[PDB]
């Protein structure tokens, strides 16, 4: 008699995944609307790889051929949501590429910040995803690839993530990145705030980017 019923997993991030985020979510940074370069940054490299994977498989864009960026202001839920039509991933990508298995740039991240790097070259080290924590105490990512099942991801960086099947509304492929915002970072839901940050640091993203400023209409919540 349940409305739902599903199984949730959850995965144990690997050390230094742990260690990079504890750093991050943790430590002041006087510059962290970089986190949204490089979402929109892994948003474009999805978009790249599905674009390319269509140039010899046209029925890979049969579940949607425009490829563009959405971005997703929500105040009364407090949310920052980054929406691309990519490749999307499967249930396994999710799980290898967001904290069980690590690169040795999650290391030489962490080294480099030790030798003076800025935290702003953290997409040189493939581990941009992660300076999502300068701004959210939240992170849920909702993907869905081709020929597979729409999946939820899951981590406020506790040391554990969690992965489950995603029965909400159902997207034709691609990533949404949701960012549940800290208290005192409310500004990046602003629309003037996040024009200055895509006309400073996207100037050379070759997808559109659109803005959906999201309310809830009263009553209606
Ligand atoms: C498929 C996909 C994957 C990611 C992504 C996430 Cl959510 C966390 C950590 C790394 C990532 O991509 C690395 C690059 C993935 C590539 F190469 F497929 F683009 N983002 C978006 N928007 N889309």
Do not use: C
């Not at 691309?84 to 991240?109: E, H, Q, R, V, Y």
């Not at 080294?111 to 790097?117: D, I, P, V």
């Not at 099942?149 to 990533?175: I, K, L, N």
Request: hydrophobic share 35%.
């Amino acid at each position: 008699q349940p409305m739902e019923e599903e199984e949730v997993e959850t995965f144990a991030f690997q050390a230094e995944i742990a260690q990079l985020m504890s750093l991050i979510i943790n430590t002041f940074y006087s510059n962290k609307e970089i986190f949204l370069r490089e979402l929109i940054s892994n948003s474009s490299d999805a978009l790249d790889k599905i674009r390319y994977e269509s140039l010899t498989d046209p029925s890979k864009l049969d579940s949607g051929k425009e490829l563009h960026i959405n971005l997703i202001p929500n105040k009364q839920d407090r949310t920052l949501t980054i929406v691309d039509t990519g490749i999307g991933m499967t249930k396994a990508d999710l799980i290898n590429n967001l904290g069980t298995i690590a690169k040795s740039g999650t290391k030489a991240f962490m080294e480099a910040l030790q030798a003076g790097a800025d935290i702003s070259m953290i997409g040189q080290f493939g581990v941009g995803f992660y300076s999502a924590y300068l701004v959210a105490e939240k992170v849920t990512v909702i993907t869905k690839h081709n020929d597979d099942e729409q999946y939820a991801w899951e981590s406020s960086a506790g040391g554990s993530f969690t992965v489950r099947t995603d029965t909400g509304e159902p997207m034709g492929r691609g990533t949404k990145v949701i960012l549940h915002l800290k208290e005192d970072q409310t500004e990046y839901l602003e629309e003037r705030r996040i024009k200055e940050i895509v006309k400073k640091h996207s100037q050379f993203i070759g997808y559109p980017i659109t803005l959906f400023v999201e309310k809830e209409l009263e009553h209606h919540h």
